[PDB]
Amino acid sequence: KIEEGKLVIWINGDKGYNGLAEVGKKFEKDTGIKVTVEHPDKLEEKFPQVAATGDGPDIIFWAHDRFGGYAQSGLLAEITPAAAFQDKLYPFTWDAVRYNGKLIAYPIAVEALSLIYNKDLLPNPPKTWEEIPALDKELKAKGKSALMFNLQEPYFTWPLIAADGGYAFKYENGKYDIKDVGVDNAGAKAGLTFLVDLIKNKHMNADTDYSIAEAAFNKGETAMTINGPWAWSNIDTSAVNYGVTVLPTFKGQPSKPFVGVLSAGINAASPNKELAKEFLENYLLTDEGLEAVNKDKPLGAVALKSYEEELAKDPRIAATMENAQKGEIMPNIPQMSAFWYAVRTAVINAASGRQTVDAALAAAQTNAAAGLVLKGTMRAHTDMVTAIATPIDNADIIVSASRDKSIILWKLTKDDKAYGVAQRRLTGHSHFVEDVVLSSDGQFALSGSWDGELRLWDLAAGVSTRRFVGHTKDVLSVAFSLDNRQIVSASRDRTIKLWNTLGECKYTISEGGEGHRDWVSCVRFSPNTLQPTIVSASWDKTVKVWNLSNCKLRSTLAGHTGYVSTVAVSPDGSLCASGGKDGVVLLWDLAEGKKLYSLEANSVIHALCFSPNRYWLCAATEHGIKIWDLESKSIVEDLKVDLKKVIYCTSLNWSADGSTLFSGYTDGVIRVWGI
Ligand SMILES: OC[C@H]1O[C@H](O[C@H]2[C@H](O)[C@@H](O)[C@@H](O)O[C@@H]2CO)[C@H](O)[C@@H](O)[C@@H]1O
- 292 and 20 Cβ atoms separated by less than 8 Å: yes
Q: How far, in Å, from the CA of 66 to the mean position of ligand 1?
A: 9
Helix (H, G, I), strand (E, B) or coil at 373: strand
Ramachandran quadrant class, 154 (left: phi over 0; alpha: psi -120 to 50; beta: rest): alpha
Residue 396 sits in a domain whose CATH number is: 2.130.10.10
Residue 418 structural domain? 371-675
- 340 with 309, same domain: the answer is yes
Domain-ending residue, one of 370, 393, 423: 370
Shortest-distance atom of ligand 1 to CA 156: 1
- 279 with 402, same domain: the answer is no
Q: How far, in Å, from the CA of 63 to the mean position of ligand 1?
A: 7
- 429 with 481, same domain: the answer is yes
Q: How far, in Å, from the CA of 157 to the mean position of ligand 1?
A: 11
366 lines ligand 1 (CB under 6 A): no
63 lines ligand 1 (CB under 6 A): yes
- Residues 14, 23: Cα–Cα separation, whole Å: 17
Question: Closest Cα to atom 9, ligand 1: which residue?
Answer: 63
- Give me the phi and psi of 558, to 5 degrees please: -100, 150
- 348 with 415, same domain: the answer is no
What secondary structure letter does DSSP report for 281?
I
Task: Give the bridge partners for 89, in sequence order.
Answer: 304
209 lines ligand 1 (CB under 6 A): no
Q: How far, in Å, from the CA of 155 to the mean position of ligand 1?
A: 6
- 414 with 526, same domain: the answer is yes
- Residues 652, 672: Cα–Cα separation, whole Å: 9
- Residues 621, 455: Cα–Cα separation, whole Å: 28
- 408 with 518, same domain: the answer is yes
Q: How far, in Å, from the CA of 505 to the mean position of ligand 1?
A: 64
Shortest-distance atom of ligand 1 to CA 111: 11
- 260 with 408, same domain: the answer is no
Residue by residue, DSSP assigns 533-599 as EEEEEETTS-EEEEETTT--EEEEE---SS-EEEEEE-TTSSEEEEEETTSB-EEEETTTTEEEE--
331 lines ligand 1 (CB under 6 A): no
Helix (H, G, I), strand (E, B) or coil at 137: helix
Pick from 407, 322, 396: which is nearest to 115 by CA? Answer: 322
- Residues 68, 70: Cα–Cα separation, whole Å: 6
Q: How far, in Å, from the CA of 42 to the mean position of ligand 1?
A: 11
- This structure's resolution (Å) is 2.4
Strand 253-254 relative to strand 258-266: parallel, antiparallel, unpaired?
unpaired
What secondary structure letter does DSSP report for 272?
-
- Residues 603, 587: Cα–Cα separation, whole Å: 16
Question: Closest Cα to atom 2, ligand 1: which residue?
Answer: 155
Single-letter amino acid, residue 613: N
Question: Closest Cα to atom 7, ligand 1: which residue?
Answer: 155
Q: How far, in Å, from the CA of 50 to the mean position of ligand 1?
A: 20
70 lines ligand 1 (CB under 6 A): no
- Residues 645, 667: Cα–Cα separation, whole Å: 9
Pocket test for ligand 1, best of 44, 155, 332, 344 (most atoms within 8 A of CB): 155
Question: Closest Cα to atom 3, ligand 1: which residue?
Answer: 155
Question: Closest Cα to atom 19, ligand 1: which residue?
Answer: 63
Give how far the C-alpha of residue 659 lies from the chain's centroid of Cα atoms, to the nearest Å: 12
- Residues 450, 432: Cα–Cα separation, whole Å: 6
- 170 with 302, same domain: the answer is yes
Domain-ending residue, one of 319, 335, 370: 370
14 lines ligand 1 (CB under 6 A): yes
Residue 128 sits in a domain whose CATH number is: 3.40.190.10
- 366 with 501, same domain: the answer is no
What secondary structure letter does DSSP report for 66?
G
Shortest-distance atom of ligand 1 to CA 153: 1
Task: Give the bridge partners for 457, in sequence order.
Answer: 445, 464
Shortest-distance atom of ligand 1 to CA 15: 13
- Give me the phi and psi of 24, to 5 degrees please: -65, -40
**Structure-derived torsion over alpha carbons of residues 429, 431, 435, 440, reported in degrees to the nearest 10:** 0
- 231 with 171, same domain: the answer is yes
110 lines ligand 1 (CB under 6 A): no
**How many Cα atoms are found within 13 Å in the side-chain-facing hemisphere of 190?**
18
Query: Which CA distances in Å does 335 have to 6, 72, 162, 179, 202?
Result: 33, 11, 18, 10, 34
Shortest-distance atom of ligand 1 to CA 260: 9
Shortest-distance atom of ligand 1 to CA 336: 21
Helix (H, G, I), strand (E, B) or coil at 2: coil
Question: Closest Cα to atom 13, ligand 1: which residue?
Answer: 14
- Residues 229, 674: Cα–Cα separation, whole Å: 38
Helix (H, G, I), strand (E, B) or coil at 19: helix
C-alpha triplet 555, 558, 560: angle, nearest 5°: 150
Experimental method reported for this structure: X-ray
Q: How far, in Å, from the CA of 15 to the mean position of ligand 1?
A: 12
- Residues 4, 584: Cα–Cα separation, whole Å: 59
Domain count within the chain: 2
Instruction: Write the CB contacts of 451 (distance below 8 Å, at least 6 apart in sequence).
Output: 429, 430, 431, 474, 475
Domain-ending residue, one of 370, 391, 424: 370
- Residues 184, 350: Cα–Cα separation, whole Å: 13
- 366 with 470, same domain: the answer is no
Single-letter amino acid, residue 407: I
End-to-end CA distance of the chain: 27
- 358 with 421, same domain: the answer is no
Residue by residue, DSSP assigns 587-644 as EEETTTTEEEE--B-SS-EEEEEE-SSSSEEEEEETTEEEEEETTTTEEEEEE-----
- Residues 158, 257: Cα–Cα separation, whole Å: 6
Ramachandran quadrant class, 316 (left: phi over 0; alpha: psi -120 to 50; beta: rest): alpha
